[PDB]
Amino acid sequence: MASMKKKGSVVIVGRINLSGDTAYAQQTRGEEGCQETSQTGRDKNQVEGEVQIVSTATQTFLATSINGVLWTVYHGAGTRTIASPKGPVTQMYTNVDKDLVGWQAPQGSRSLTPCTCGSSDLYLVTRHADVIPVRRRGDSRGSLLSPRPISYLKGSSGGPLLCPAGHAVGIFRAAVSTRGVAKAVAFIPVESLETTM
Ligand SMILES: COc1ccc2nc(C)c(O[C@@H]3C[C@H]4C(=O)N[C@]5(C(=O)NS(=O)(=O)C6(C)CC6)C[C@H]5/C=C\CCCCC[C@H](NC(=O)OC(C)(C)C)C(=O)N4C3)nc2c1
Numbered sequence: 001m002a003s004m005k006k007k008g009s010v011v012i013v014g015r016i017n018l019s020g021d022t023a024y025a026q027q028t029r030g031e032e033g034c035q036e037t038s039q040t041g042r043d044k045n046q047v048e049g050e051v052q053i054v055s056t057a058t059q060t061f062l063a064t065s066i067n068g069v070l071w072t073v074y075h076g077a078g079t080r081t082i083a084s085p086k087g088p089v090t091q092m093y094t095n096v097d098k099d100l101v102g103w104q105a106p107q108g109s110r111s112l113t114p115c116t117c118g119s120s121d122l123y124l125v126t127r128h129a130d131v132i133p134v135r136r137r138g139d140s141r142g143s144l145l146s147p148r149p150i151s152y153l154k155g156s157s158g159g160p161l162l163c164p165a166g167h168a169v170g171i172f173r174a175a176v177s178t179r180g181v182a183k184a185v186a187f188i189p190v191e192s193l194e195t196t197m
């Protein structure tokens with residue numbers, strides 16, 4: 001009992017910058033500082049933007065702020081706290097059945113607005129700041145206009161699918177893979193986030 005370890009916090013280590021005309025990834029914390037912040041849960045770094053790059057000791061993925069909540073996938077975050085300036089913050093939403101978790105959005109982040117356009121021309125944002133056109137094909141699936149090896153999408157779970165006007169349509173969850181090629185993606189629809197709320 002006395003030696004049982006604690007899992008560390010999820011740590012914001014960068015962001016996907018969408019503020020201007022060029023999308024690009026920014027790193028805001030290196031691997032050593034990430035490891036230390038994960039164990040303490042105390043992250044005093046400035047947060048900006050809608051799409052964060054996040055890490056645990058063993059994985060790296062994305063998280064997206066919608067309606068004042070920073071959302072990501074359960075398969076990346078599990079039940080972990082997130083590091084914050086005052087110490088670890090507990091998830092306010094956890095739904096393993098949806099592969100969904102959420103924490104209160106960090107001070108300084110910006111939130112996306114849920115889409116009400118009813119449009120099926122979407123855009124997936126990856127951890128490399130690629131903006132991938134995706135045609136919506138059902139409630140929780142979309143096809144890539146240009147299929148990509150799954151290598152290209154790995155590490156982008158938790159990222160957004162957006163409509164043409166930049167509203168949030170969903171959270172990227174899984175790639176639909178044939179012979180290692182992603183022809184489609186599965187996502188958590190923003191309406192499911194809204195119901196979880
Ligand atoms: C533990 O509790 C849970 C609860 C719910 C759950 N729901 C799940 C749906 C679930 O799927 C598993 C995780 C998820 C996954 O790899 N996502 C990311 C990603 O980038 N991840 S990540 O950032 O690298 C990482 C790994 C966090 C750091 C987006 C894709 C990028 C590339 C695809 C690589 C090859 C895997 C292809 C799987 N295709 C797949 O299953 O397709 C369907 C059509 C669904 C069969 C798939 O995509 N997969 C399996 N695992 C869970 C686990």
Ligand SMILES: [Zn+2]
Pocket residue numbers: 114115116117118119163164165166167
């Ligand atoms: Zn919209």
